[PDB]
Amino acid sequence: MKIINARLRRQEALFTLDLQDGIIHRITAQAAMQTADAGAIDAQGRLAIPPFVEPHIHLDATLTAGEPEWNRSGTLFEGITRWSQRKASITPEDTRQRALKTIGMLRDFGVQHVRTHVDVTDPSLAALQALLAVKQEAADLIDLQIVAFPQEGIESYPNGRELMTRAIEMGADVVGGIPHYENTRDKGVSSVMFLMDLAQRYGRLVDVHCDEIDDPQSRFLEVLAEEARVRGMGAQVTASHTCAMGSYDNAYCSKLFRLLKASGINFISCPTESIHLQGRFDSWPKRRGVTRVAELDRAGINVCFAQDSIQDPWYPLGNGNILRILDAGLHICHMLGYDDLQRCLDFVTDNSARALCLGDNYGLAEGRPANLLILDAENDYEAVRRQARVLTSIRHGKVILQREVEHIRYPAN
Amino acid sequence: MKIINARLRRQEALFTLDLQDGIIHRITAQAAMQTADAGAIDAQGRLAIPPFVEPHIHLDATLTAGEPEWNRSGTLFEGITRWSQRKASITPEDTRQRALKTIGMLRDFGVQHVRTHVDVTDPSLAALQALLAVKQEAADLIDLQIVAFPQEGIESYPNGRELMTRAIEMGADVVGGIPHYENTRDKGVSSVMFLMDLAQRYGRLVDVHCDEIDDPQSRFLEVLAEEARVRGMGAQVTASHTCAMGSYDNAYCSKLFRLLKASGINFISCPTESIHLQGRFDSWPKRRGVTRVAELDRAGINVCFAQDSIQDPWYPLGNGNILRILDAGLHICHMLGYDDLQRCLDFVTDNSARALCLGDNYGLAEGRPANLLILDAENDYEAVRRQARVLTSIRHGKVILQREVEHIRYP
Ligand SMILES: Nc1nc(=O)[nH]cc1F
Ligand SMILES: Nc1nc(=O)[nH]cc1F
Ligand SMILES: [Fe+2]
Ligand SMILES: [Fe+2]
Questions:
Q1: Which residue of A has its CA nearest to B333?
Q2: Same domain, B186 and B82
């Protein structure tokens, strides 16, 4: 299949992309606009990018907001209580139906790579069973990674170490954790030691809910980064949230950055989720509660944005559109400078792909899989400013989604 | 013209809206999802609302981002510097062309009511002249209100008082102000006294940029509210921004609220603008810098949301879509409760209309102007969740915008 008149990120020239056998066969700069022969897609000067990535979402909990009760306080902790209640009625088929519906939303907005956390603090591991099957069933739309996520703690929940182990042995791709939620500081530390041992023993990736709390004493990130560094696993390890970093002592944080850089770990921020869940224990002034995204990025540290929740016990909105999350993140993290906006798509594509260790299975380069979108915009700035629609989504060389370009009529002239 | 099968806000019932001679002739409850007759518009269970309002925007500065230099710090103060530079080459034609294009964006997203601030710290009053003209020219799309806004201060700029007076004489609807930017506290206070005298003498509305700064000592709001209360002009008065309130001592703020309630003034918050401009002088933790929107609303005080800027020396983004602003404000102000979401369109429709004193010229009631939208959603919650598109905009009983319903194909 041929795509002509396509823009590529941060370049002026138009390109033709030749897709064959499910991979990108050739990419070639054109002289100017050209005409689509039969069986050629004309991108019409629109941007072609690799697919959006959703590197952190809770598909087991998606679409359960209000069941059986609402999170009245809007806090992380009440959300956990509400989820605990909903867990009483989770079945594999219930999980499957909700997850597939949310996957449809992600697909509608150009997401082809998803990393989902699944709560394994449930002796039945019902949601895990369902999502391991969804991974197979939904492969025509997405590549799904599954994180074994001990929502109620590893050290603090009955048989927590055993449940994490079962989940990894069943084939969860990523080992999770929640050290700030363990009952004591010492158990928070030992949970990190366990999960890293587990990840290393089974050769899995790591993605830990790390310091998702406004307490400036929540410093489990240093433990994770140092284990990553010592074990030589940096690239395989992601720290999600790190909200407490947004409240750290600045002298400590400056020291910390040396280790963060040295460890080579990745960071995920969920700005719409954290703006909603953080700052709840302040009066006024009210902190933003988001990690230091701009600063990590300027230090050469890989950071990206994620939606986290869609209509679940923690977050009542969500429609699958990662560009809305990008917009929120640039605002809250003070990244609306000219240079930030010229490359802002990094934070929902390339950086996220690096966090998920997609390697050569991602990106527009000859020889890589033919997975791409055509966006209704010419560049990064216009993409975020207009919240550009995904006009075409192509997966394994096939068109899986097509939108018409919006047309507004003015009947009164 | 007849619209059938329309949802109205916060009800499950279906309605027919009958429009004649530019007004809403009849609103009738239906007993079913009806088959449409040849002439009728079938809303198909979609929500009909009065138009979105943009109660605070700077049209004179719109689409000037980067001219002649960028706001590198992303601060309110550098923004004023860059604007001062851009103002050096502002002309009426320049203002008119940019303002019309942004008005086009606002129209595209269902905005029919707009209050623009115009910088009158300019002895040529170029932008004001242009916008007074645009108010008439663009009346087929929007009802525009103009605020005489002394960007560089009243007491603090050469002939500031005389320029404010001249701007009002020329026909500005609203008297503006910027007390926290005056050079001393005492001059901030005197500027409020002057601007209230000016508004009261010429019978104009008031809308002040009030305490747009993270300084907890910035307390001009109390002076503004007290003057409003004493003069009996609360309903005519609006305080825009009030970012400092998000940093006030809490005992003081609790006391202040009694005055805010008694004064009857309105509040406008610009969440995307403030999240961008505020908190710049903190390290960590970093404050939100937005006023106490949820608290004002719970105290029965009228508050609403606005875009503030579209691609200007203060804010590099913007596309005219007020629903994105609503989204931002609900998140940043911690108003994502179930109850909040069920009525969240208040903050970009009814509340804003109240701030602009639109009265019976606004709202879906018999006898009122046939100005309304059909949104691609059934209720407030879905409208903000999906960022619902405006499918139809009707003004004075005529369709002025039509969008196709989006249809995704899956091959
Ligand atoms: N933000 C969240 N934190 C958690 O620990 N669980 C689920 C969530 F959505
Ligand atoms: N937020 C703003 N404050 C001002 O004083 N001027 C212009 C703006 F856009
Ligand atoms: Fe999460
Ligand atoms: Fe303003």
A1: A276
A2: yes
